[PDB]
Amino acid sequence: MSTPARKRLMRDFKRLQQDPPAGISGAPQDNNIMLWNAVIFGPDDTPWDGGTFKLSLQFSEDYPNKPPTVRFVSRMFHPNIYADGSICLDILQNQWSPIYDVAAILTSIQSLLCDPNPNSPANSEAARMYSESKREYNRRVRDVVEQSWT
Structure with missing residues (x-):
């Protein structure tokens, strides 16, 4: 059988x-x-390079009118990612459009890694560090990168 969300989710998969x-x-x-x-790889030539990050996307029977609940399974340290793994991202809360598909959602999250929005402090410690001394931030990014391998 095929519900409207199901039908959509199958197209999104292919x-x-x-x-x-x-x-x-x-x-x-x-x-x-x-x-x-x-799984999202930290892009090449960024302090995120080499990381293998896990994520879980939970959909509802009202997709695509309502966006999926996305969260990080692997520990992160980024200005726009909360302590529980949830992501303070534009298109996932206030700017969602049924046009966006799963692939577009993941693309945006990957791009978000190396390009945080300081004006959306989900992680306040990470936010300050990112803007004050990038030297301590890169060190901390490297950590979640090394522990994602385990």
């Missing part, structure tokens, strides 16, 4: 698969099309 964004992979559990997992 398009992520045929034209995948570099360093991004994603998939639903064979047992639940509504719960997904994904």
Whole structure:
């Protein structure tokens, strides 16, 4: 059978698969099309380089009118990511549009890593560090990068 969210989520799955964004992979559990997992590589030539970050996307029966609940499974340290893994991101809360697909969601999160919005302090310690001395920030980014490997 095919519900409108289900029908959408199946199209979203195929398009992520045929034209995948570099360093991004994603998939639903064979047992639940509504719960997904994904992995994002810290892009090349950024202090995030080499990291393998895990994520969970939870969808509802009202997708795509309502955006998925995205969260980091692996520990992070970034100005726009809360202590629980949730992401203070534009298109995921106040600027969501049904046009955006799963692939577009992940793309934006990857780009967000190396380009934080200081005017959205989800992690206040990380925010200050990013703008004061980038030397201590890069050191701290390196850490979550090394522990994501484990």
